[PDB]
Symmetry: C4
C-alpha cells in the first residue's frame, strides 16, 4: 500500500553513493566513481531523482563538475532547469559546458519542438517534466528574474520567441490548440510572463522603453480579448508599466529624464547607462529581500561539504606521509 | 528553595562530558568514552537530559553515532522523538539503526500498548513523556509534516491506526475512557491530526483523493457530533479540502484535471505522477518559509563542531608526526 | 570639534591587539600577550571599550578565556553584564570562574550596596554603568528571559530581593528616595520586572502558581496606587496571569489540571513535572522567533575566528615541521 | 541585438581571474598576479565591473588588500563608495590606506569640485558615477547610517559642508543652478539628508541637541519655502526631532534630563556620556533588525573563501613536504 518510486530495493553501493551525493561528500564520490565499475550512476533515490539532481538541489559545485566528467549521465537538462529555478550561478555555468549544450542546440529552440516532438531531454522520472513543456531555460530564468543567468543564456544566443496571434490559423498553432486547450493557454501565458520580465526586457533589446510599452499595449489587448487568465495578462502589463516607471525614477540628470520622455549615438549611450543603473538597483533590491529557509539549507550543506573535504584531506595526508616516514623507520 | 533536577552534584568528568556533548566536541567524547571506565553515560544535565538528548537537540550526527555505538544507553526513544520533532533527517536514520528499532517493534505499535501498558520506552526524567502517550513517531512526523521522515517510517512498516468510533463499546475503549476523559479526547484529536496531514495522505494511500474526501466527511461528522474540540475537528477537514484543492491546482494537462475530477492502469500512473508533483511543490513551499532562530542555532553548533574537529585533528597530527621525526633526530 | 573618547592616539601595538580582539584572531592575541611586556591590556577603542568588552560583544569564547587568564584586567563585571544582555551562555559560565565572582560576592548583593556605595565594579568608561545602578546580573537575566543563565546565577546563590513598600519609612529607602525620585522609581519597576519574569518565577520558587498570583495581586495594587508608570505595573501583572494561564494550558492529564486549580508529596512531583514542561515549551517558542541581525553577526565572527585559527595553525605546522626536516637535509 | 558592456570577448586568463575575484579564491589570484605579466588587472566582467569591485561587492578582505598592493589599479574610489554603501568596515579601513586617500585629498572635498570639475575619480564604466556627483564618502556613510565608518571618515578630517541659501546669488551656485535644476535640488536634499543623520549629528558636533534643533528649524523653513521635495524636507526635520526625543528617552538620572532640557565642564561630561549611550543603543537597535539576503550572501562567500584557502594550503603543504621527503627517499 506504500507509495515508492524506486521499485527495486537499493544496494549498499547506491545507498552510500546517493547519501554522499546528497550531502556533498566529495572524496568518497571520487572513490566510488573510480574503484567501482558496477556502479550505475543513473540510480535514483526514494523520490526518483538522480545523483546529479540531488547534487544540484543542494548546491555542491565540485561533485557536479565531477559527475559531468562522466559520460553515461542522464537528466542533465532537468538539472539545468533545477539550477536555474533555484538560481545557482556557478552550477549553471558548469552545466552549460556539457556537450549537449555545446552549440546552444537545446537551450531555447523552437525549430526543435519540445512540446510537439518527444525530445525527452528535459525530463525526470521518465514520465514528465518538472515544469510545462513550453518552459525552456531562458523562460524559467525570466520567471525567476535572475540577471546573470539571463545574460549567460543570452550570450549563448538563445532568445524567447514571441507567441503567435490569438487566432493565427497556421496548422501548427491549430494543432497545438486542438491537442490541448489548457496547455496551450498556459504556454501562452508562460511565454508572455517570460517576455514581460524586467530581466529579459533589460538585457534583450536595444530600446527597452519602446519594447516595454509595445508589450504593455499588446498585453492589455490580449487581456481584454482573452477570457481565460483575464487578470494576469493585465498584471504583466502593469509590470511593464512598473518597469518603465522604475527607469524614469532611476534618472539623475534632466538629460536622462528628457532622453526617456522623448526617446530620440547619444541616446544609445544614455540608454546603455540607464540599463546598467537599473540592473544594479534591482540587484540591490533583490539582495534586500527577507531570508527564506533554502539559503540556510545551502549554507549548512556547504559547511558539511567543507567538513568532509578537510577531514578526509588531512586523513589521506597523514597516511600518505606516514607511509613515507615508515619506509625510513624500517630502512634505517 | 532552588529548583534543581539533578539532586546529586555533578563530577568534573560528567561536566566535561556533558559540555562536550552539548557543543559537539567529538574527539574529547571519544577520549572520555575510551579511557574513562567510571563514566556513567546515563548522566543528566541541570535540566535532567541525557548526553544523547543533548547531542540530538543540537544536531551533532557524529557523536550520536558514537553514543549509539555504546550499549548501556537509555532514553533512545525520546531521542528519536526529539529528532523527529525538530526534523533532523540523518539523526533519525541513524537512530533507527539501533537494535531497539530493528524489526519496527517500537515505532507505531498498538498491540504493544503505549498508554495502557507501562512500556517506559519513550520517556525522559523517569516520570513522563515529552508528548502524549498516544504520540508515536509517525504521528509526530505527520504533525511536524516532514516528508522524508514519514517515508522512512513508512518503509519500516509503521502506520497510523484509525481511532475507534465515538461510542465503540469495546472494553479497551471503555477502559481508556474511564481512566481519563481529557487524555482520551487528546489522543483522538492527535491521531486524527496525524491522519489528516498532507504527508501521511500523500505517502500512505493509493488513491489519496478518495481517502482525503472520506476523512474530510468523517471529520465533519465527528466535528458536529463531539462538543470538545468542536472547531479543530473542522479545521482538519478544511485541511483535507485544502489538500484536494492543492492537488487540483497542481494539474497541468486537462487529462490530469479529468483524472482528479473523475477518479476512474492509467489512473494509477497519473496519480503517481501527481503525488510526486505535490510532494516536490510542498517541499519548495516549506523551503520558502521565513527563518526561525533554531536553524541558526544548528548552524552555529555545526560550526563549533567543525572547529573542534579540525583543531584537535591537526594537533594530534603534529604530535603523531613529530614523534616519528623525533625518533629520527635522536637516532641519527 | 570631533567627538572622540580615547584622547590619546592609539599605538600600533594597541591597534593590532584591538582589531585582533574585535575579530577573534586568537593566535596573534596569544603572541601579543606573551612577547609584548609593554602592552597595556586596559587599552580602549575609539568608543572607549576594553579588549574584553570587544571580545565578549562578538562572541569569541577562546580569547575571553585567554584574557581572563590575565590578572590586570578591568571592567569584568560589565563584560558579564554584556554577555548576559546578549545571552552568550559559555561566555557567562567562563566569566563566572573569575576570582571576583568566586563566592558570589558581586552577583546580586544588597548588603554591598551598588547604588549607594560607589563600588565601581559594574562600570565602563569610568563614568557610568551600561544599565541602571539597581540592575544586577540576575535582574538583567530575568529581563532578557534566558533560562540557562538564570539557573546558573541561581546555583551561585544569588536571588532578587523584593523591593520595599510604597512608603517604607526606613531611612535607607527615604535616603534613596530623597537623592533621586526618577532613579528610585526606575529601580522599583526594574526589580518588579525582574520578579515577574517567567524565568525567575519558574526557577526560583517551589510553588510557582502561588508566587505568581501573589505577585500579580501585589503588582495590581502598586499599579492603581502609584501614578508614575501606572500602566507598566499592570502589564507585569498581565504577564503573571499569562504565566499561570500558560501553566494551565500545558497540562495533559486531568490530574495536572486539578493539581493546578486546587494547589493541594504528590503535588511537589506534579509541579516539578509541569515546571520542566513549561521551561522546554518556552525554550522552543524562544527558538521559534524570527531572526535578527546580531545572530548572523555572531556567525560571521565565528567563521572569521575559525579562518584565523586554521590558517595560522597550518602555517605554524609547516614551519615547525620543515625546520625538523631541514635539520635532516643539512645533516645527511 | 544583445546588451553587452564588454565589447571585447574575454580571454581565459581574465575569465579565471574574474571568477576567482568574484568567489574569493585567494591563492590562484596570488598565482595570477605573480606569474602572469600579460594580465590586465583593469579587466571588466560581463556587467563592466573591475576585479576590485567584484572583490569588494562580495566582502573578500584578503584579495582586496592583495589588489591594493598593485599600483595600476583603477576605480578605487567607487570601490570605497560600494564598501561604504554595503557597510564593510575592514574593507573601508583597508581601502583608506591607498595612496589616493593619504592626506584625505579625495574624501569630502569641496575646494576640489567633484560635480563641476571632471575629477573622474569616483567612477565606474568610464561614463558615470554609482551615485550622484554630490555624493561623497561621508555623505553616503551618513545615508547608510553606519557609525564606525562615519567615525573613521571624521578622523580623516572630512566633514559635510552645509549647502548654500535657497538664493545665494554667488556665481558658483548660480552656475550650478543654471547647468541643471533637478541635479541641484537632488544635491541639496542629499546633503541635507547627510546633515540630518543621527550618525553625523552624534559624532560631528559638540552640542548635538543644539545642532539638531537648529537643523530641524532650518529644514522646516526650507520645507515650507521650497516646493520640490516639499515633504522630504519635513521628514528630515521629523528625524531631527526623533533624534532629540531619543536623547531625552535614554536619560537615566534626573540630572541628565535637566542637562538636556536646560543645555547649560559638567555639561560637556554629561553630553559625552549621553552621546555614547545613544550610540550603543542605536547600534543594538540596528543589530535587532530583520535579516536580508545580502548578509547570507556574505556568509556563503566567506565560507567558499575559507574552503579555497584551506584546500590549496593543505595541497601546497603536502607537495612542499613530500618533495623534501622524496629528496631523502632518493638520497638514502
Amino acid at each position: 500500500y506504500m507509495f515508492s518510486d524506486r521499485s527495486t530495493s537499493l544496494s549498499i553501493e547506491e545507498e552510500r553513493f546517493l547519501d554522499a551525493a546528497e550531502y556533498g561528500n566529495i572524496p568518497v564520490v571520487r572513490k566510488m566513481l573510480e574503484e567501482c565499475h558496477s556502479l550505475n550512476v543513473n540510480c535514483v533515490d526514494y523520490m526518483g531523482q538522480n545523483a546529479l539532481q540531488l547534487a544540484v538541489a543542494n548546491e555542491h559545485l565540485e561533485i557536479t563538475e565531477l559527475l559531468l566528467k562522466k559520460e553515461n549521465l542522464s537528466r542533465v537538462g532537468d538539472a539545468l532547469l533545477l539550477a536555474i529555478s533555484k538560481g545557482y550561478v556557478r552550477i549553471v555555468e558548469a552545466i552549460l559546458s556539457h556537450p549537449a549544450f555545446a552549440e546552444g542546440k537545446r537551450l531555447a529552440t523552437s525549430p526543435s519542438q519540445s512540446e510537439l516532438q518527444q525530445d525527452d531531454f528535459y525530463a525526470y522520472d521518465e514520465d514528465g517534466t518538472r515544469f510545462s513543456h513550453d518552459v525552456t531555460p531562458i523562460i524559467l530564468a525570466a520567471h525567476c528574474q535572475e540577471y546573470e543567468i539571463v545574460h549567460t543564456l543570452l550570450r549563448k544566443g538563445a532568445r524567447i520567441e514571441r507567441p503567435h496571434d490569438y487566432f493565427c490559423k497556421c496548422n501548427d498553432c491549430n494543432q497545438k490548440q486542438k491537442h490541448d486547450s489548457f496547455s496551450h493557454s498556459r504556454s501562452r501565458i508562460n511565454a508572455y510572463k517570460g517576455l514581460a520580465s524586467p530581466a529579459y526586457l533589460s538585457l534583450s533589446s536595444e530600446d527597452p522603453v519602446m519594447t516595454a510599452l509595445e508589450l504593455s499595449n499588446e498585453l492589455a489587448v490580449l487581456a481584454n480579448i482573452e477570457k481565460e487568465f483575464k487578470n494576469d495578462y493585465k498584471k504583466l502589463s502593469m509590470q511593464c508599466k512598473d518597469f518603465v516607471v522604475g527607469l524614469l525614477d532611476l534618472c539623475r540628470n534632466t538629460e536622462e529624464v528628457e532622453a526617456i520622455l522623448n526617446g530620440d549615438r547619444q541616446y544609445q549611450k544614455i540608454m546603455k547607462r540607464l540599463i546598467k543603473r537599473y540592473v544594479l538597483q534591482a540587484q540591490i533590491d533583490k539582495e534586500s529581500d527577507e531570508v527564506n529557509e533554502g539559503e540556510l539549507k545551502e549554507i549548512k550543506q556547504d559547511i558539511s561539504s567543507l567538513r568532509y573535504e578537510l577531514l578526509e584531506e588531512k586523513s589521506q595526508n597523514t597516511e600518505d606521509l606516514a607511509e613515507l616516514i615508515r619506509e625510513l623507520g624500517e630502512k634505517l
